[PDB]
Amino acid sequence: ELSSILLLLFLYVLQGIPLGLAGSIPLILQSKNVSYTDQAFFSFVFWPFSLKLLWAPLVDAVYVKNFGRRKSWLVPTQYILGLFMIYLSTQVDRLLGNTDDRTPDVIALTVAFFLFEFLAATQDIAVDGWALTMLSRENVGYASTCNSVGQTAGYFLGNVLFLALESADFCNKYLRFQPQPRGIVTLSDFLFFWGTVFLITTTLVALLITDTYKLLFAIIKMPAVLTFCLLILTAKIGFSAADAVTGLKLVEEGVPKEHLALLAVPMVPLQIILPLIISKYTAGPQPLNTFYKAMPYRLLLGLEYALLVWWTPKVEHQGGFPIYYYIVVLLSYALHQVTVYSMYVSIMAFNAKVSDPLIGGTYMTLLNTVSNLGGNWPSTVALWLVDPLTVTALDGYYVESIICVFIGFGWWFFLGPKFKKLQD
Ligand SMILES: CC(=O)SCCNC(=O)CCNC(=O)[C@H](O)C(C)(C)COP(=O)(O)OP(=O)(O)OC[C@H]1O[C@@H](n2cnc3c(N)ncnc32)[C@H](O)[C@@H]1OP(=O)(O)O
């Protein structure tokens, strides 16, 4: 069934294109020198892909007659998302402010990328339901690893490829003979091209209830998973400050967003390799053991991010930017994403350990939803608390990183044994 799994791979690359763009916009807005209250108001865009389960039964409960049950919300979501990308490519010339140095109207850009993300998340639900019925039962795990590789490849084409092809600096150092300004593609041309790709793949793929919410209310009423809910909400505060603010403080204190995006291309082979290493801790009877043993390493790499942002102004920016800075920040991001990926596969292994086969297909993604909510809300609280902590004499990111590391080690030393006993 190669004729369908390549189409499903292409639909997950088109899933990853809005996520890649939504991850690229904070780097662009920080390159335009916007304040962090505006950045935290933008950071609501990362929440619908986390909280897609809150409308997943609403989009899996209804469909149209004499048509596919999940194709009924695949192709209208794809058409609305593509037409919205055409309109956003028209209006993004004035939303970012590339005309006469105007300020980025971030609120309209927030609601644009928020509804855009929302459409991306419900299209992910439509494909994740569509994967169970289009291909055979024998290839059901191939759909899951195809979701993984397609999401990562489409996020690569929107976060890394777009920023690598967005500026004049990288596109006149590399990828071009006879250098010329304004880069390969702007955001208007990139959005217009992927909107055209959305419309054509949508036309080709088209021509060729409250009981679930009552169940979710009963689950979140159940005590042990409610304890896991509160724990995974208050868990990721300790490193969400580093993981949310460091990528923008590096853009302010000097390293370009294009190099910070291209810094992720050595990580996708390691993103392949690392679950094949931590598969033993996944299959083990205590799946939160590598969570609890990767928590302090992730907080110490949060301090190492704070030290790296402190070290960024003390290295020379003029002329050829040095490669030892890039090998330091690449080993830093490499070890930090090692502990990110070990923590994430520990959460996935805990959900596979706990989720019963009765309502497992809902309870699995419920715990995934609540872990991603607990990952994405202290991002917004961190970016909102950047600006009141700037005493720039004393910067706010360093005192925020110290306070959030104290919150994370407080979480660790106070709620370690409880979170370790929740798996029994
Ligand atoms: C929305 C989604 O895609 S799924 C979210 C739920 N899953 C999770 O694991 C929780 C993580 N929650 C987050 O918010 C994560 O930081 C992300 C990955 C979703 C990114 O959201 P943000 O808070 O806006 O972080 P941001 O995109 O600004 O990071 C700056 C970029 O520069 C890079 N970067 C970050 N830190 C550094 C650093 N110290 N040095 C060099 N580069 C860095 C990263 O490649 C990052 O891009 P990414 O999205 O691939 O991680």
Author numbering: 71 to 278, 294 to 476, 505 to 537
Reproduce the article's own wording on this structure.
Subsequently, we resolved the cryo-EM structure of the SLC33A1/acetyl-CoA complex to a resolution of 3.5 Å. In this structure, SLC33A1 exhibits a typical fold characteristic of the major facilitator superfamily (MFS), adopting a cytoplasm-facing conformation. Of note, the two halves of SLC33A1 open to the membrane’s edge between TM5 and TM8 near the cytosol but are securely closed on the opposite side, between TM2 and TM11. Additionally, the linker region connecting TM6 and TM7 is positioned externally to TM2 and TM11. This configuration strongly suggests that the substrates would likely access the central cavity through an intracellular portal framed by TM4, TM5, TM8, TM10, and TM11. On the ER side, the luminal gate is predominantly sealed by the interaction of TM1–2 and TM7–8. In particular, the adenine group is nestled within a hydrophobic pocket formed by residues Thr331, Leu335, Leu345, Leu348, Tyr390, Val414, and Tyr418. Among them, the two tyrosine residues, Tyr390 and Tyr418, encase the adenine ring through π–π interactions. For instance, the 2′-hydroxyl group of ribose forms a hydrogen bond with the backbone carbonyl of Leu345, the 3′-phosphate interacts with Tyr225, Asn229, and Tyr418, and the 5′-pyrophosphate is cradled by Phe116 and Tyr225. Our results revealed that mutations Y225A, N229A, Y390A, and Y418A significantly impaired the transport activity of SLC33A1, highlighting the importance of the polar and π–π stacking interactions with the 3′-phosphorylated ADP moiety for the recognition of acetyl-CoA by SLC33A1. Importantly, our molecular dynamics (MD) simulations further revealed that the binding of the 3′-phosphorylated adenosine moiety of acetyl-CoA to SLC33A1 is stable, whereas the binding of the tail part, including pyrophosphate, pantothenic acid, β-mercaptoethylamine, and acetyl moieties, is relatively unstable.
To date, SLC33A1, also known as AT-1, is the only identified acetyl-CoA transporter within the cell. This protein is localized to the ER membrane and is responsible for transporting acetyl-CoA from the cytosol to the ER lumen. Acetyl-CoA in the ER primarily serves to acetylate the lysine residues of secreted and membrane proteins, as well as the terminal sialic acid residues of gangliosides. Notably, disruptions to SLC33A1, whether due to insufficient or excessive activity, can lead to various diseases, especially those affecting the nervous system.
